[PDB]
Design a protein around this ligand. Structure first.
Ligand SMILES: [Mg+2]
Ligand SMILES: [Mg+2]
Ligand SMILES: [Zn+2]
Ligand SMILES: [Zn+2]
Ligand SMILES: [Zn+2]
Ligand SMILES: [Zn+2]
Ligand SMILES: [Zn+2]
Lengths: 50, 576, 117, 46, 67, 538, 275, 49, 49
């Protein structure tokens, strides 16, 4: 479970994991399964004496 | 500060548990829709495009469910995501073969929100149990919520720019839970004051008054037109009310068609017309004015609100009891549809003509004021002579201020009563006042005749300008204008001085309103935090969170307050 | 916009049909027809055209909603006379009257190439 | 892309693909304007 | 501002009758005669023109209408 | 009266107000002086001796309207209207959308709303000229008919003509100006305006820089939407700590390119670049958007009767006059008498006759004009019902309506209340893992608030399970393992194998509980205070 | 059907800008609906595609584009001949379903220049363009027949744009409506008593009231029926009003015939049989 | 601020011609917020010496 | 040199105060924009009485 960084699936090792800021979702297109987890989006968090 | 972080001051308690954000919710401005059934709510397509439901796949609808998956996010009747039994979820927007994608029974599919779905709707601020109700959605154009007028009534919503909030449950228990409880039809009667909460109002109430008129006659063509408007109908055309010289139907006949056919509500016409009794008994020439319906058939009587609802003796309460919420809701939606359509064709307006009264009476009214003006002077001079007699237990000033007040009240009332007489029944304003809508005689006085005395805490305008109100007045002036009396009408206009006194009182209403608005939220909180500790038990005894008994049984009977009703025992009859 | 385009008021989708025909399940020789992307404007003359027919036991129509573009018509006629014929008769009579109205209009306008005086 | 905005006060295009400090010939002012887009743009008359 | 063609209440054109009106005003200090000459027999149309106002000329007053 | 002629002389030559002050025929007066002076209401009546209860008057008002403020001065005959409505108008007047100056083009404020075809008030107060209101109007005098219609105008709303919307009814432009600055981010670290490619930079989540120019800025006139990158810039961070090959074209080029919030759609209006006192290079861009009247949007009368557009209909559907005149607006009659706003009728009655007269009427509350009968008599002269009421034909059946209708022109306000900016919803999205609460709001696509009182109602509702769904499932869901030996939440949990409760030597008697995650945090917070709370079903 | 109205027709008055006539022997529902037909139903050509190549004038393109809509294009060339662009299966547009327009102006003159419909030209085959001294080689112009002043230009301002006029009708948008307010009257004496008219002296007399002219404050007949509808059509200029009426009358008939065909199709598609 | 409770807002009569009575926000700041009269003016201060 | 003082618009020291409307439009200034409030960091600022 150390193999995260951005690419893995139970059926295949993920090749791409797009970040959909709009819905705040993580999508893996080539099979079809949210890798789960949206950590609160870095694109939402891209506006942020002696 | 570690204690502070917890402490409540935006802490774990108040700043998190007592108030947080949730999903599957929407809020917009509100718009009216009398055409909507009482359970309907109008819903924006974008919201419907935004809102979804995750349904678990069953073999009975799996093929359709698969079509939603196949339809996908690219249209409203499709689905955004599917959640597999093992827990895996799929984005169909980026799925390479959304239509070809496999699926089976037991999987969950996140499909778009559809019509006919039950949601929970709320006012904000929330003040009572009817303030949150389960509703049926209606998907519509433009980002507006459309609602039935009568649903505004428990909500007290205003389309001036109010927003209200809606929540969509995602569990079938809760869908049942909302359906069996949160749904509006059960909310009709309040247990707080064993009365109905629904109320047909304004345009609808006015046209109903208009519709009860004796001069109401219909044509066969329009009867068919009216019949189609019906949300439900027997399919059997009724017999004409008139056959000769020409076949005709009455509005009372047709209103009675709307009425369910084996229930009656009796007498409470509750209108000014007739004679505070005694007179209408003269001789039972007992019809028209007084209300009476038999076997779902209206015999006579112009309708009112006390008949129409939110009061004791109302038709609405008894229909709820006999016909139940479900039949009563369909009757109510139906009547509103019909009355609206009749109103639409009948029409209603208002103009300066409605402000017109008789010149001579209007001439008499001013002269009535002139005598009262003269009457004040008689009172002023006697006091200045110190020949005026002080009222027992009061000072001479208290008597004087009281005495001038009776005169300013008697005259205004007299001149008002002249205006009540001076207006035709033809008038929209009298029509609006009589129907039980937003008006009254005092309004007529204010618009046509006289606004009356302005006061500070009930007292005449104080001498803030050094024993005076204004430098336009003489010193030691005691005229009613010098103390805020608005003699003119809204039609007559106001003097510069009267307008100012009028502006001042408007502040008193407004300031009190703002202060009252903040405080009620606070007082309630004090109230709720106390009363939250108690609930009813299965042994009928009323108990608290530590199971101790409050009462032997709730309300000393254990019965529902809604099932209670106003009755005369009459056993306290005078003569034994 | 969170609202449909204007042509959608009258234009039908490829899965839609202009009118739908249903028999009444309540009274004999009656039917209820649903017309899509249409208003009372059509509805009212046809009701009137059917009302003009004495063989009609019942005729009526309504939109399901004014915002919505659809109407439903319930009609009942004598048991020997089908409601379909009444609608068919009413439209054919009405179209015929319109053609003559146009022709008289043509006669009326044509009747002053210069002036009436 | 020949575009680059135009100075505001001299009212003249500088016109180059440069990381220059928003300077401008003759007109020392920094106020810059960018040319209209070179793209197909449909307008309705509604 | 920039006289909209067609009176919102009816549809009566006036895409050039503003300046003509202004011409009519310079020619005749009778709005009634001006309003009538324009042909705006309807007061909805009259309200359109009567309550119109054109500040653009002040906008034109600026020199920096070059970039 | 000769002094007036001097005031007239001032238009060409000179005769200053100060000279009028120097003339000493008028003086400037404080409240302390007012206590002693005998003030007069009017020159005319008070000079009369026949009924001179007093004649010791010392000074007189220029005009009673001088008490009035900027807002009150706008509405005619406020005294024929209920007093608070004017305060509501005074507030709501401020709430109205409109023009504000002349050079809008040079102006690039964050937000603006301007009307295509504003109109000076058909009925005006003379002072509004000094307010330059006719120069800068903020509404139009629309012709309205007062009728309930279908009830879609009930309670603070109105039905409006969609076909009129087609002609350009109250349509407006909305301008938003965006500004963006470049600046250092450390001794070496800094933002860098550019058009980075997806492989030559990271932090791009998914958005593309197609709209951009090589400078990193979008071109003027470009069509925009609520997702794409509006300004392109990226900041490399460590410059050396990356070292050795984890090179990539993205390197350390962290994205900081500005994009549009997930809501707005439109076209690029203007782009301006310059520098400030800080010295840093910065740019300002104006984005144009168009505001059209829609159902539910907030509007208002000049008489403080606000309302939203309840719906919009085509002109054909609308009921019409003998000419076939459809009103611009359909207001509910009943809303006026409850508020007692007779003045609202006077705008209409004065406006009707003025329109027919082809001449403007003054809106001063105080006159001798006898506006009631004389206007009514005059309304009869143009060939109309003297009270203003008129019969109209049905919009659908064409039949004449049973009641007669009061119809005429009225100054109306478009209020600053974009309903589409007021709407907000979510079903799932970004959260706040620190508390597992939903995002702050719409500008971050957050969830909607839940208040103490909705909870209070929900208890009164008795539907505990819906609250449970709402408090737990619809906000904060969690699973916890506890040791059977102790209610203390202690596990290492090989989330694929073992669980264990260290300190209790638990190897198998692990148990799972469902609580909120934010609640577990509170509990951990108690433990940090050396408290050991525990919990069991027994 | 055994009996129908004879739709009596009488034309009172006609011009290129208006037509006044009286229709008799007909239903009120027919009169209103045909009236509703006069506005919405009539097909017309209007601009749907606009490209602005250059604009150094003060106004923003979308203001002009909305205005381009507001332009009253005459429809006197059988605009119905053009196929709908949607149905014309052409790449977005073609001369068989579109007209093309182009405008280019530059103010080199120091004084304020005015821009007019004339600056806009129909690049597509000369189907009758905007009404600006094109119909009127007639010594009867209003004052100039410059119908619409597009905008004004102080020295230095320029405007370059392109336009596509396309087929449409009033129901689609009011810009496609070839008619202003439509005048209508029946039964001025109010013998039908559709409304009270309390104190009829408070009601001035209508021009049609003048017929039976009467000083009896409003004669009455309970058996009466709506008859002798008085019409006055007010064309917006886009077409001659009577010709608008014929196109309206033709369209409504066509609208009905298609429903009958569909009605046949409803019974064809159904299992029902009739003969 | 200083001096609170049992003081409130309503109106003073001398305000006549000094402030518009209608010109106030409908918020809680109502009456608490005032507005200059059409022709009111303010003393700038001088030396009586 | 002691400081840079922020000045009220239309001040005596606001040299535009003498310029005509035509001058002001020449400056691209609004003739019906009397000011009377400071501009701080490009933002408009008004003192409340
Ligand atoms: Mg409210
Ligand atoms: Mg309300
Ligand atoms: Zn995958
Ligand atoms: Zn330069
Ligand atoms: Zn007009
Ligand atoms: Zn343990
Ligand atoms: Zn084509």
């Amino acid at each position: 479970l150390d193999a995260l960084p951005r690419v893995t699936c139970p059926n295949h090792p993920d090749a791409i994991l797009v970040e959909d800021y709009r819905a705040g979702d993580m999508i893996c297109p080539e099979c079809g399964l949210v890798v789960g987890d949206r950590v609160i989006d870095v694109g939402s968090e891209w506006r942020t004496r002696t | 500060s570690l204690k502070q972080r917890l402490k409540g001051k935006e802490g774990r308690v108040r700043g998190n548990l007592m108030g947080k954000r949730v999903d599957f919710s929407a809020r917009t401005v509100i718009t009216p829709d009398p055409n909507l059934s009482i359970d309907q709510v109008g819903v924006p397509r974008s919201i419907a495009a935004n809102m979804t439901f995750a349904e678990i796949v069953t073999p009975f609808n799996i093929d359709r469910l698969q079509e939603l998956v196949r339809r996908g996010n690219s249209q409203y009747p499709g689905a955004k995501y599917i959640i597999r039994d093992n827990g895996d979820r799929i984005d169909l927007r980026f799925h390479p073969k959304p239509s070809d994608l496999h699926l089976q029974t037991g999987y969950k599919v996140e499909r778009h929100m559809c019509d006919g779905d039950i949601v929970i709707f709320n006012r904000q601020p929330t003040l009572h149990k009817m303030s949150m109700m389960g509703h049926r959605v209606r998907i519509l154009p433009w980002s507006t919520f459309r609602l039935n007028l009568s649903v505004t009534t428990p909500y007290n919503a205003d389309f001036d720019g109010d927003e209200m909030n809606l929540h969509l449950p995602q569990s079938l228990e809760t869908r049942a839970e909302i359906q069996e409880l949160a749904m509006v039809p059960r909310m009709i009667v309040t247990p707080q004051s064993n009365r109905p909460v629904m109320g047909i109002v304004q345009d609808t109430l006015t046209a109903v008054r208009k519709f009860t008129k004796r001069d109401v006659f219909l044509e066969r063509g329009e009867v068919m037109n009216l019949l189609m408007f019906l949300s439900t109908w027997d399919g059997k055309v009724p017999q004409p009310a008139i056959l000769k010289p020409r076949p005709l139907w009455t509005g009372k006949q047709i209103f009675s068609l709307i009425i369910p056919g084996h229930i009656n509500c009796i007498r409470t016409h509750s209108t000014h017309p007739d004679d505070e009794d005694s007179g209408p008994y003269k001789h039972i020439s007992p019809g028209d004015t007084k209300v009476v319906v038999e076997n779902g058939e209206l015999i006579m009587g112009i309708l009112c609100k006390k008949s129409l609802g939110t009061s004791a003796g109302s038709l609405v309460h008894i229909s709820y009891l006999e016909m139940g919420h479900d039949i009563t809701r369909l009757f109510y939606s139906n009547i509103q549809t019909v009355i609206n359509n009749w109103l639409l064709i009948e029409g209603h307006t208002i103009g300066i003509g409605d402000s017109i009264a008789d010149s001579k009476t209007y001439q008499d009214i001013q002269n009535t004021i002139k005598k009262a003006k003269q009457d004040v002077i008689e009172v002023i001079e006697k006091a200045h002579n110190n020949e005026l007699e002080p009222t027992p237990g009061n000072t001479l000033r208290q008597t004087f201020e009281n005495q001038v007040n009776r005169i300013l009240n008697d005259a205004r009332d007299k001149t008002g009563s002249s205006a009540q007489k001076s207006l035709s029944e033809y008038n929209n304003f009298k029509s609006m006042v009589v129907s039980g809508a937003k008006g009254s005689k005092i309004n007529i006085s204010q618009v046509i005749a006289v606004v009356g005395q302005q006061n500070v805490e009930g007292k005449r305008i104080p001498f803030g300008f050094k024993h005076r109100t204004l430098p336009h007045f003489i010193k030691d002036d005691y005229g009613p204008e010098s103390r805020g009396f608005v003699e003119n009408s809204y039609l007559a206009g106001l003097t510069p001085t009267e307008f100012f006194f009028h502006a001042m009182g408007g502040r008193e209403g407004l300031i009190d309103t703002a202060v009252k608005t903040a405080e009620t939220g606070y007082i309630q909180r004090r109230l709720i935090k106390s009363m939250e500790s108690v609930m009813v038990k299965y042994d009928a005894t009323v108990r608290n969170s530590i199971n101790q008994v409050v009462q032997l049984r709730y309300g000393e009977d254990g019965l529902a307050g809604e099932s209670v009703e106003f009755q005369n025992l009459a056993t306290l009859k005078p003569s034994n | 916009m969170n609202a449909p385009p204007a042509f959608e008021s009258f234009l039908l989708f490829e899965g839609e049909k202009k009118i739908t025909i249903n028999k009444d399940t309540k009274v004999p020789n009656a039917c209820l027809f649903t017309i899509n992307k249409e208003d009372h404007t059509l509805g009212n003359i046809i009701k009137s055209q059917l009302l003009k027919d004495p063989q009609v036991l019942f005729a009526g129509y309504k939109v399901p909603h004014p915002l919505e573009h659809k109407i439903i018509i319930r009609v009942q006629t004598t048991p020997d006379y089908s409601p379909q014929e009444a609608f068919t008769n009413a439209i054919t009579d009405l179209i015929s009257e319109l053609s003559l109205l146009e022709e008289r209009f043509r006669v009326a306008i044509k009747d002053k190439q210069e002036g009436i005086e | 892309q020949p575009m680059i905005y135009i100075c505001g006060e001299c009212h003249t295009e500088n016109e180059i693909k440069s990381r220059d400090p928003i300077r401008c010939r003759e007109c020392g002012y920094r106020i810059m304007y960018k040319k209209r887009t070179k793209r197909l743009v449909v307008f309705d008359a509604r | 501002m920039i006289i909209p063609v067609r009176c919102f209440t009816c549809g009566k054109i006036v895409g050039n009758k503003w300046e003509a009106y202004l011409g009519l005003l310079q020619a005749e200090y009778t709005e009634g005669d001006a309003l009538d000459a324009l042909g705006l027999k309807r007061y909805c149309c009259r309200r359109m023109l009567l309550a119109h106002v054109d500040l653009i000329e002040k906008l034109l007053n600026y020199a920096p209408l070059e970039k | 009266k000769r002094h007036i002629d001097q005031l007239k002389e001032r238009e060409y030559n000179n005769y200053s107000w100060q000279d009028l002050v120097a003339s000493g025929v008028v003086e400037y007066i404080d409240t302390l002086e007012e206590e002693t002076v005998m003030l007069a209401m009017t020159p005319d009546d008070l000079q009369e001796k026949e009924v001179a209860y007093c004649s010791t008057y010392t000074h007189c008002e220029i005009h009673p309207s001088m008490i009035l403020g900027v807002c009150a001065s706008i509405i005619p005959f406020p005294d024929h209207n209920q007093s608070p409505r004017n305060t509501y108008q005074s507030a709501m007047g401020k709430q109205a959308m409109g023009v504000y100056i002349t050079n809008f083009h040079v102006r690039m404020d964050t937000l603006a709303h301007v009307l295509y075809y504003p109109q000076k008030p058909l009925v005006t107060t003379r002072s509004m000229e000094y307010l330059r209101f006719r120069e800068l109007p903020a509404g139009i005098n629309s012709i309205v008919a007062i009728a309930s219609y279908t009830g879609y105008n009930q309670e603070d709303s109105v039905i409006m003509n969609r076909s009129a919307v087609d002609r350009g009814f109250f349509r407006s432009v909305f301008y938003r100006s965006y500004k963006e600055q470049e600046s250092k981010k450390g001794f070496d670290q800094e933002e860098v305006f550019e058009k980075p490619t997806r492989e030559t930079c990271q932090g791009m989540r998914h958005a593309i820089y197609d709209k951009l120019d090589d400078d990193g800025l979008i071109a003027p006139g470009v069509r925009v939407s609520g997702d794409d990158v509006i300004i392109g810039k990226t900041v490399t961070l460590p410059e050396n700590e990356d070292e050795l090959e984890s090179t990539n074209r993205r390197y350390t080029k962290r994205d900081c390119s500005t994009f549009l919030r997930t809501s707005e759609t439109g076209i690029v209006d203007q782009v301006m670049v310059t520098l400030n006192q800080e010295g840093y290079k910065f740019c300002k861009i104006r984005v144009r958007s168009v505001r059209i009247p829609q159902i539910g949007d907030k509007f208002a009368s000049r008489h403080g009767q606000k309302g939203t557009c309840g719906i919009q209909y085509r002109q054909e559907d609308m009921p019409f006059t003998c000419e076939g005149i459809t009103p611009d607006i359909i207001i509910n009659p009943h809303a006026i008498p409850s508020r007692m706003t007779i003045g609202h009728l006077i705008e209409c009655l004065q406006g009707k006759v003025s329109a027919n007269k082809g001449e403007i009427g003054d809106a001063t509350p105080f006159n001798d004009a006898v506006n009631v009968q004389k206007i009514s008599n005059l309304l009869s002269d143009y060939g109309y019902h003297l009270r203003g009421n008129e019969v109209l034909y049905n919009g659908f059946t064409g039949r004449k309506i049973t009641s007669q209708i009061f119809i005429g022109p009225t100054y109306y306000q478009r209020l600053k209340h974009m309903v589409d900016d007021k709407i907000h919803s979510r079903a799932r999205g970004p959260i706040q893992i620190l508390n597992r609460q939903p995002m702050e709001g719409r500008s971050r696509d957050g969830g909607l608030r839940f208040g103490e009182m909705e909870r209070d109602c929900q208890i009164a509702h008795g539907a505990a399970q819906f609250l449970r769904e709402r408090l737990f499932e619809a906000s904060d869901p969690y699973q916890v393992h506890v040791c059977n030996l102790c209610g203390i939440m202690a596990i290492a949990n090989t989330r694929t194998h073992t669980y264990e409760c260290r300190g209790c030597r638990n190897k198998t008697q692990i148990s799972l509980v469902r609580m909120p995650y934010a609640c577990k945090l509170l509990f951990q917070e108690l433990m940090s205070m050396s408290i050991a709370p525990r919990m069991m079903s027994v | 059907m055994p009996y129908a109205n004879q739709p009596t027709v009488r034309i009172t008055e006609l011009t290129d800008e208006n037509v006044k006539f009286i229709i008799e022997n007909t239903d009120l529902a027919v009169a209103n609906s045909i009236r509703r037909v006069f506005i919405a139903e009539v097909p017309i050509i209007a601009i749907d595609w606009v490209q602005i190549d250059a604009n150094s004038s003060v106004l923003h393109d979308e203001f002009i584009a909305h205005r381009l809509g507001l332009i009253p294009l005459i429809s006197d060339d059988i605009v119905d001949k053009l196929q709908y662009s949607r149905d014309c299966t052409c790449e977005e547009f073609c001369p068989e379903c579109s007209v093309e327009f182009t405008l280019d102006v530059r103010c080199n003159e120091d004084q304020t220049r005015h821009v007019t419909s004339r600056d806009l030209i129909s690049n597509s085959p000369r189907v009758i363009p905007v009404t600006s001294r094109n119909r009127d080689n007639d010594p009867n112009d209003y004052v100039e027949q410059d119908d619409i002043l597009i905008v004004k230009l102080r020295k230095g301002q320029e405007l370059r744009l392109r336009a596509y006029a396309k087929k449409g009708f009033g129901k689609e948008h009011a810009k496609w409506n070839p008619t202003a307010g439509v005048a209508f009257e029946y039964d001025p004496d109010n013998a039908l008593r559709h409304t009270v008219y309390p104190k009829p002296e408070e009601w001035p007399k209508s021009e049609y009231s003048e017929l039976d002219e009467d000083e009896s404050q409003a004669p009455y007949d309970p058996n009466g029926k709506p008859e002798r509808f008085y019409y006055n059509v007010e064309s917006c200029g886009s077409l001659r009003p009577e010709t608008i009426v014929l196109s309206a009358l033709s369209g409504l008939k066509k609208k009905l015939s298609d429903l009958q065909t569909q009605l046949s199709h409803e019974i064809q598609s159904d299992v029902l049989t009739i003969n | 601020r200083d001096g609170k409770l049992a003081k409130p807002r309503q109106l003073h009569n001398t305000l006549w011609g000094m402030v518009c009575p209608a010109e106030t926000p409908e918020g809680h700041a109502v009456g608490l917020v005032k507005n200059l009269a059409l022709m009111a003016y303010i003393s700038v201060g001088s030396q009586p010496s | 040199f002691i400081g840079k003082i922020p000045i009220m618009l239309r001040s005596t020291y606001c040299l535009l105060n003498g310029l005509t409307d035509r001058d002001l439009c020449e400056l691209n200034e609004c003739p019906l924009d009397p000011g009377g409030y400071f501009i701080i960091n490009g933002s408009e600022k008004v003192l409340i009485a």
